Swiss-Prot record, chain A:
Subunit structure: Component of the NOP7 complex, composed of ERB1, NOP7 and YTM1. The complex is held together by ERB1, which interacts with NOP7 via its N-terminal domain and with YTM1 via a high-affinity interaction between the seven-bladed beta-propeller domains of the 2 proteins. The NOP7 complex associates with the 66S pre-ribosome. Also interacts with NOG1. May also associate with the origin recognition complex (ORC complex).
Compartment annotation: Nucleus, Nucleolus; Nucleus, Nucleoplasm
Protein name according to UniProt: Pescadillo homolog
Gene: NOP7
Native organism taxonomy: Eukaryota, Fungi, Dikarya, Ascomycota, Saccharomycotina
Role this protein plays: Component of the NOP7 complex, which is required for maturation of the 25S and 5.8S ribosomal RNAs and formation of the 60S ribosome.
Extra facts: Present with 4530 molecules/cell in log phase SD medium.
Curated annotation (Swiss-Prot), chain C:
Similarity field: Belongs to the eukaryotic ribosomal protein eL8 family.
Organism: Saccharomyces cerevisiae (strain ATCC 204508 / S288c)
The name this protein goes by in its record: Large ribosomal subunit protein eL8A
Subcellular location per the Swiss-Prot or TrEMBL entry: Cytoplasm
Its job: Component of the ribosome, a large ribonucleoprotein complex responsible for the synthesis of proteins in the cell. The small ribosomal subunit (SSU) binds messenger RNAs (mRNAs) and translates the encoded message by selecting cognate aminoacyl-transfer RNA (tRNA) molecules. The large subunit (LSU) contains the ribosomal catalytic site termed the peptidyl transferase center (PTC), which catalyzes the formation of peptide bonds, thereby polymerizing the amino acids delivered by tRNAs into a polypeptide chain.
Source organism superkingdom: Eukaryota
Note: Present with 238000 molecules/cell in log phase SD medium. There are 2 genes for eL8 in yeast.
Subunit structure: Component of the large ribosomal subunit (LSU). Mature yeast ribosomes consist of a small (40S) and a large (60S) subunit. The 40S small subunit contains 1 molecule of ribosomal RNA (18S rRNA) and 33 different proteins (encoded by 57 genes). The large 60S subunit contains 3 rRNA molecules (25S, 5.8S and 5S rRNA) and 46 different proteins (encoded by 81 genes).
UniProtKB/Swiss-Prot annotation, chain D:
Source organism: Saccharomyces cerevisiae (strain ATCC 204508 / S288c) (Baker's yeast)
Record's protein name: Ribosome biogenesis protein RLP7
Comment field (misc): Present with 7720 molecules/cell in log phase SD medium.
This protein's GO CC annotations: cytosolic large ribosomal subunit; nucleolus; preribosome, large subunit precursor
Family that this chain belongs to: Belongs to the universal ribosomal protein uL30 family.
Function field: Involved in the biogenesis of the 60S ribosomal subunit. May act as a specificity factor that binds precursor rRNAs and tethers the enzymes that carry out the early 5' to 3' exonucleolytic reactions that generate the mature rRNAs.
GO molecular function, one term: structural constituent of ribosome
Keyword Nucleus carried by entry: yes
Covered residues, full protein: 56 to 322 of 322
Residue numbers of Phosphoserine PTMs: 202
Gene Ontology biological process terms, A to Z: exonucleolytic trimming to generate mature 5'-end of 5.8S rRNA from tricistronic rRNA transcript (SSU-rRNA, 5.8S rRNA, LSU-rRNA); maturation of LSU-rRNA from tricistronic rRNA transcript (SSU-rRNA, 5.8S rRNA, LSU-rRNA); ribosomal large subunit biogenesis
Subcellular localization(s) per the UniProt record: Nucleus, Nucleolus
Keywords carried by this UniProt record: Acetylation, Nucleus, Phosphoprotein, Ribosome biogenesis, RNA-binding
Curated annotation (Swiss-Prot), chain E:
Residue ranges constituting the RRM domain according to the UniProt record: 4-82
UniProt lineage: Eukaryota, Fungi, Dikarya, Ascomycota, Saccharomycotina
Gene Ontology terms: cellular component: cytoplasm; nucleolus; nucleus; preribosome, large subunit precursor
Protein name: Ribosome biogenesis protein 15
Compartment list: Cytoplasm; Nucleus, Nucleolus
Organism: Saccharomyces cerevisiae (strain ATCC 204508 / S288c) (Baker's yeast)
Length: 180, 268, 93, 246, 133
RNA sequence: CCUUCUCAAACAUGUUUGGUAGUGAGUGAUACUCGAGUUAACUUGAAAUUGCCUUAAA
């Protein structure tokens, strides 16, 4: 309401200052409330992985933003790089829907699905607001899980990325995982 | 090129003609050179770039010296780029041109021309008060739209393109050297699209007749190699002309990558 | 942006500013002293006696005036919620 | 319709037509290559990168791969016939549309002509792969269908049966040929439909209007219309532009 | 009385015949639109005339645009009195120059310029000027 | 209710070549080249009565 008032009055600099002086909500306390146990978080991150890998392959539309897509792609690349470095994969399956991977994460079996790199068409008959809310929750949960996994394995979180390697191929090799 | 005795006699007779006994007492003492060319100087395309003719004797410094007893004094305007107006101040010109007695009264830029003097009346009042206008060679191409067409109706209000950049960077030394060279050695001449070229030599009271003779001899010597001229005349305002040159032989000359790129960008 | 000027003046120790003149008493005094080039008077003033004498005063002092709709519009002009009057006194070249 | 709008449109269209006429005359003189009077006789590329730096260099003449994005042009300007024809041939009839262009000596004057309506960049391999794997569409005709319809580039068998004579097997080979500018590059480029991107700012709430204001300020800062008939071709960070628009 | 003829003046640079017709077609049907232009160049003289099929529409257009501030120009619109039709306003273009033929031979033109030089010599002698040749 | 060609190469900070086509109206003398092109300078509120592409969207 105050930003609308500033824009209606024509004080663009005041509107910019109002936009700069704002704070958004976080879901860390809700994550801690819902998953008191790291084994519970490990048991439940499978749906998070599925949702994030699905959303990373989607193109940007009016409802879904490039920032959200890039965040999902970045966190998926971090998870893939962690699994590849710690050498935890156990099972693979290449089905017509996509590639299922089963890995061993802290003694628990985690199975997730990765789509193929093809331009999937949006049906425009689903609840994108609901899916984006779930995506935000899953992003916070996987941020917590990945930070704890990196700290337990003895790796820096978040890992730095190689810009030239990312401009070559934007994959899991962009992020180089360091020790201590 | 020109007989010394003939040109001396012509200049002395024309300076005797003025002294027989508003603008009537003032405009009649300006010496004019008429150059008649067999063809047009430029051709089918107009030209506003004033040609600079080098002479041994100074011309603008006598104008400044003799303008102290006139209503409209001699003034210098300098037009430079917007990105380079901040590198130069009045003191930068003063400490580099104080020895030669050269003073630049006002320095403006394109932003000033497009904001402060945008109105026609104010722009005319600002432009008409200057006598020597110098402009950067980079910005001189934008001047017909900014300064307007009235400034191009006179020789003095037409800007002079000067070299200000050395090694593709702004050079105060190069700018000052070009201003000094224009002020001391060279004179501007307006090239028409017709056959009649008019050169304003100045005023009889400004310089001695022998200095005028030297200036006109060097001007003729330069213009003979510059163009295939036909006739040369010397006159004063409200006075007839006197010929000084004649030649005959030069009159004997009187008688698709675009589609390739389209095909390249097109599929068939 | 006023605080940006004060810090700059403290470091040095500023050009002449041009701004819209506002405030009823200030504008009336400017009109009486013949300093206002142009006056804008809001039409929806309550109580109306605050501005009901302004056109006659401007006419007597030879100050060009115009009645405009919106004290809220004049307020947006002078960074206020409302403004009964606005005045232009000095302008740039 | 307001007379101010009509007069502004007429003046802006006249200035644009004058600029196009001057560019056309200069490029005709360059094509003739026997003109004594000319301002400059070579090609300039001006790279603007990010507090922004600009580097002006001479075009080496070697062919290059450019990504071209159609944007909304100058305010109150009707597009002249030559620019409209070039855009229609390049399949950029609407904004938020991107194509690939093989830049050569004949292509450079076309870029000079259509400069104020396009954003031109040097795309990276990752950007090209993201563009094709995220927004890849073709026009395909079925055996049991009377009229073809646009579909996503999802079948490698379709690419095999359409471009198998030239040696193109799949989308990866399409990407390789586009990036390397080898044989059948134009064939693959016109096999792919022009890429329909999305706007960086969408909506008309207060936040989105502020984002629009910031975007317009940044666009005015980056893209500059010289209108000098010899202006260098502007090259921007097309990687970051594609990151914002995809 | 009053006619259906509108005289417009203080028009900006971009206001021409087509712009005037397009703008005042919204006011009413226009029989003829003309603009005063220079003869040698295709530049307007910043005034023109329009004709309405309806004099009431012409009066409405005048009372709408009589004191309209447009791009720094205060447009001036008047209704012409009874009669006085508009005429002799040709749409000029930017005229071009070209070199024509010279049928006078070299010898004849040399003789003509020599005769002109002799006439100049005679004038110099007449006007009390003592110069050689 | 838009905003105006803000420069290039050649040689050794210097020399040379190319790059600049305009608000309208009026006053005016004076010469030059074949109804055409040029030629001292004075006024003016941006003045004026007729030379036959759509997310800058509702």
């Amino acid at each position: 309401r105050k930003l609308t008032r500033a824009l209606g009055r024509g004080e663009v600099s005041s509107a910019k200052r109002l936009e700069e002086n704002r704070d958004s909500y976080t879901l860390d306390h809700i994550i801690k409330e819902r998953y008191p146990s790291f084994p519970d978080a490990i048991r439940d991150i499978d749906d998070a992985l599925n949702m994030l890998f699905l959303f990373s392959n989607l193109p940007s539309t009016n409802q879904v933003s490039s920032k959200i897509i890039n965040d999902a792609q970045k966190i998926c690349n971090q998870w893939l790089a962690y699994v590849a470095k710690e050498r935890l994969v156990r099972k693979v399956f290449v089905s017509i829907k996509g590639v299922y991977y089963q890995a061993n994460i802290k003694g628990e079996e985690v199975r997730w699905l990765v789509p193929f790199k093809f331009p999937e068409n949006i049906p425009s008959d689903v609840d994108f607001r609901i899916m984006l809310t779930f995506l935000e929750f899953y992003s916070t949960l996987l941020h917590f899980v990945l930070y704890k996994l990196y700290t337990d394995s003895g790796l820096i979180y978040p890992p730095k990325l190689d810009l030239k390697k990312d401009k070559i191929i934007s994959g899991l090799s962009s992020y180089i995982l360091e020790s201590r | 090129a020109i007989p010394r005795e003939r040109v001396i006699k012509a200049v002395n007779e024309l300076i005797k003609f003025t002294s027989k006994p508003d603008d009537e007492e003032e405009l009649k003492k300006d010496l004019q050179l008429i150059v008649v060319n067999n063809k047009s100087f430029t051709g089918t395309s107009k030209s506003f770039k004033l040609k600079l003719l080098n002479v041994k004797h100074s011309f603008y410094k006598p104008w400044k010296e003799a303008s102290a007893t006139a209503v409209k004094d001699f003034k210098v305007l300098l037009i430079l780029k917007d990105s380079d107006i901040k590198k130069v101040s009045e003191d930068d010109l003063f400490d580099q041109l104080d020895s030669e007695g050269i003073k630049v009264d006002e320095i403006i830029c394109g932003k000033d021309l497009k904001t402060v003097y945008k109105a026609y009346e104010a722009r005319n009042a600002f432009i008409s008060q200057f006598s020597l206008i110098l402009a950067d060679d980079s910005i001189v191409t934008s001047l017909p739209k900014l300064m307007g067409g009235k400034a191009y109706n006179k020789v003095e209000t037409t800007p002079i393109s000067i070299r200000t950049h050395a090694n593709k960077e702004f050079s105060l030394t190069t700018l000052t050297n070009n201003i000094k060279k224009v002020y001391m050695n060279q004179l501007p001449v307006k090239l028409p699209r017709g056959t009649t070229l008019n050169v304003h030599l100045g005023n009889l009271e400004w310089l001695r007749p022998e200095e005028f003779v030297d200036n006109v001899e060097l001007i003729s010597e330069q213009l003979i190699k510059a163009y295939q001229i036909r006739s040369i005349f010397i006159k004063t305002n409200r006075s007839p002309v006197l010929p000084l040159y004649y030649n005959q032989d030069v009159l004997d000359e009187l008688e698709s990558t675009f589609n390739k790129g389209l095909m390249e960008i097109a599929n068939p | 942006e006023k605080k940006e000027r004060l810090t700059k003046e403290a470091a040095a120790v500023s050009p002449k500013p041009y701004a819209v003149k506002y405030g009823l008493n200030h504008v009336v005094a400017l009109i009486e002293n013949k300093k206002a080039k142009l006056v804008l008077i809001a039409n929806d003033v309550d109580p109306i006696e605050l501005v009901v004498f302004l056109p006659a005063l401007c006419k007597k002092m030879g100050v060009p005036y115009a009645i405009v709709k919106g004290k809220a519009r004049l307020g947006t002009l002078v960074n206020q919620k409302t403004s009964a009057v606005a005045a232009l006194t000095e302008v740039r070249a | 319709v307001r007379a101010e709008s009509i007069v502004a449109k007429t003046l802006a269209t006249s200035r644009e037509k004058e600029r196009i006429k001057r560019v056309s005359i200069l490029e005709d003189k360059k094509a003739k290559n026997e003109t004594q009077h000319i301002a400059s006789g070579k090609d300039f590329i001006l790279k603007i990168t990010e507090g922004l730096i600009r580097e002006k260099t001479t075009y080496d003449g070697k062919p290059a791969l450019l990504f071209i994005v159609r944007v909304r042009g100058p305010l109150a300007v009707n597009i002249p016939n030559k620019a409209f024809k070039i855009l229609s041939l390049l399949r950029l009839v609407e904004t938020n549309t991107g194509v690939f262009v093989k830049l050569t000596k004949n292509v450079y004057p076309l870029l000079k002509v259509i400069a104020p309506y396009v954003v031109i960049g040097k795309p990276s391999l990752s950007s090209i792969r993201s563009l094709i794997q995220k927004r890849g569409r073709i026009i395909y005709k079925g055996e049991n269908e009377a009229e073809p319809h646009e579909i996503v580039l999802n079948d490698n068998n379709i690419v095999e049966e359409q471009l198998g004579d030239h040696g193109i097997i799949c989308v990866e080979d399409i990407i390789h040929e586009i990036a390397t500018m080898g044989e059948s590059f134009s064939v693959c480029n016109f096999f792919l439909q022009p890429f329909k991107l999305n706007r960086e700012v969408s909506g008309f709430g207060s936040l989105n209007r502020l984002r629009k204001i910031k975007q317009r300020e940044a666009e005015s800062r980056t893209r500059q219309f010289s209108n000098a008939a010899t202006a260098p071709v502007i090259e921007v960070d097309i990687d970051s532009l594609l990151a914002k628009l995809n | 009385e009053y006619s259906g003829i509108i005289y417009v003046s203080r028009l900006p640079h971009g206001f021409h015949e087509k712009e005037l017709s397009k703008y005042f077609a919204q006011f009413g049907d226009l029989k003829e639109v003309r603009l005063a232009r220079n003869k040698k160049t295709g530049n307007s003289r910043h005034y023109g005339f329009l004709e309405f099929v309806n004099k009431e529409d012409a009066m409405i257009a005048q009372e709408s645009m009589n004191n309209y501030l447009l791009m720094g120009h205060l447009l001036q619109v008047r209704v012409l009195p009874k009669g006085a039709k508009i005429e002799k306003l040709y749409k000029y273009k930017k005229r071009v120059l070209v070199e024509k033929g010279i049928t006078k031979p070299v010898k004849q033109l040399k003789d003509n310029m020599k005769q002109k030089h002799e006439e100049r010599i005679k004038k110099l002698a007449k006007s009390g000027i003592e110069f050689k040749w």
